[PDB]
Amino acid sequence: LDSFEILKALKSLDLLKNAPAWWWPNALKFEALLGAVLTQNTKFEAVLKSLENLKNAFILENDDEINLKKIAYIEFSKLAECVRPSGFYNQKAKRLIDLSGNILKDFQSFENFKQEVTREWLLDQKGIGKESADAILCYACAKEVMVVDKYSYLFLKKLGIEIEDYDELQHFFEKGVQENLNSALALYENTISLAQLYARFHGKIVEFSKQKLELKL
Ligand SMILES: [Cl-]
């Protein structure tokens, strides 16, 4: 049992038949960074409601450089009201405002941020945990990072491997792909990058786990 074996098994189930190319809706856009932050300690279905409030108030529109500045400079109580559905709305409003302001300060633009950001820079933004930092790196910045989470932990535990530490759980998932890189890329007929492969692999694990729960299994 390595992660390349798990990737092949999950691939064979066609779990992402109705999903977009990078699994996360609106991947590689500022909206993906916002959802990666808002999903912490909650369910993605609640995040979609917060994102809808942001679009309905015209805080989030079509130009991502403008979107970044709107969050950096928004009135706190206005943002907190919009993000109520995804919970912890005072902490999450402040975390978004501060993160957005620091992206402008250190990188000047969302475009440059996607090129130059590091995981440690994101972890130095107060309140951003490892799952959220890695989801930004993969699904917003197209970096070769695989996100892990409680679902991945429980999924591997059921198969008989318990890795409670986030970075070691991540390294287990990454290294099996790295050690078998030619084979892993051939699953997609060499049409996708390793970053997109990790985007989809984490998506498979989540889709498998959500169904296990709704179907009771
Ligand atoms: Cl939180």
UniProtKB/TrEMBL annotation:
GO terms for biological process: base-excision repair. Keywords: 4Fe-4S, Endonuclease, Hydrolase, Iron, Iron-sulfur, Metal-binding, Nuclease. SUPFAM superfamilies: DNA-glycosylase. Residues 38-197 form the HhH-GPD domain. GO terms for molecular function: 4 iron, 4 sulfur cluster binding; endonuclease activity; metal ion binding. InterPro entries: DNA_glycosylase (IPR011257), HhH-GPD_domain (IPR003265), HhH_base_excis_C (IPR023170). Signal peptide: none annotated. Pfam families: HhH-GPD (PF00730). This is Endonuclease III. It comes from Helicobacter pylori (strain ATCC 700392 / 26695).
